Symmetry: C2
Subunit: 139 residues, 2 copies
């Protein structure tokens, strides 16, 4: 099992936060953030255009496709809902909530997600102030 | 990301239930159960003796080593504690609790585990009647 658990999902989540921040999704940005090497990020980003999860502009700009984005949103929603659960009901040290969520977000289901929304008190923001996207797709 | 999420952990969990049942941990048993092919189970079981997680007797019998076992126990404890959480606090359909746990057990931490025991009402049995092993190692 990979350390990122799910490479493809981690690149897509990253491109998303980078966007959320205002930054331009650039390989170099995914390389540092994910601490991924260069020809690592390259063949992986080069692997995403094959399945149509993104397009790299004639400026190395990373543009998720209507699907990549939908999936990034999915990964981002689980992640922040996981943090919400690890904080609100389990009580895991806030200093570990993230790393733990970085891991769960790749194995959580849509069903458990729908059940969390219903079981959780606040689903608009994560324990870190960020809004939780894609809840509309849930239901 | 692999479908088993964590191959090595899934073989070890399997050898464990097989033991729990009375069966002899045999490759063929891991092959059907895990639905893994043959030269798949072979090079993987053949990969476990390299890291010392098991020994294959002159009868193809699979004997976890003091460490393999400790890890199998760890995987089995998270699995059944996950089911307990997915049933007791989240309310996920019992018909999905397992598959979901089959997935989480490879990303759950010891810390979240320790917090579950404390947050969960019954930690002696899983939602399926099985006892939860290794709780002593937890704390
Ligand atoms: Ni986070
Ligand atoms: Ni992650
Ligand atoms: Ni189970
Ligand atoms: Ni599993």
């Amino acid at each position: 099992m990979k350390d990122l658990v799910d490479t493809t999902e981690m690149y897509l989540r990253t491109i998303y936060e980078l966007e959320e921040e205002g930054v331009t999704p650039l390989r170099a940005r995914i390389a540092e953030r994910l601490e991924q090497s260069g020809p690592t990020v390259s063949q992986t980003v080069a692997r995403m255009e094959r399945d149509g999860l993104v397009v790299v502009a004639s400026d190395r700009s990373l543009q998720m496709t209507p699907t990549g984005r939908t999936l990034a949103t999915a990964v981002m929603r689980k992640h922040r809902l996981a943090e919400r659960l690890l904080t609100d009901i389990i009580g895991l040290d806030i200093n570990k909530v993230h790393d733990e969520a970085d891991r769960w977000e790749h194995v959580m289901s849509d069903e458990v997600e729908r059940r969390l929304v219903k079981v959780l008190k606040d689903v608009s923001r994560s324990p870190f102030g960020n809004p939780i996207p894609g809840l509309d797709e849930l239901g």
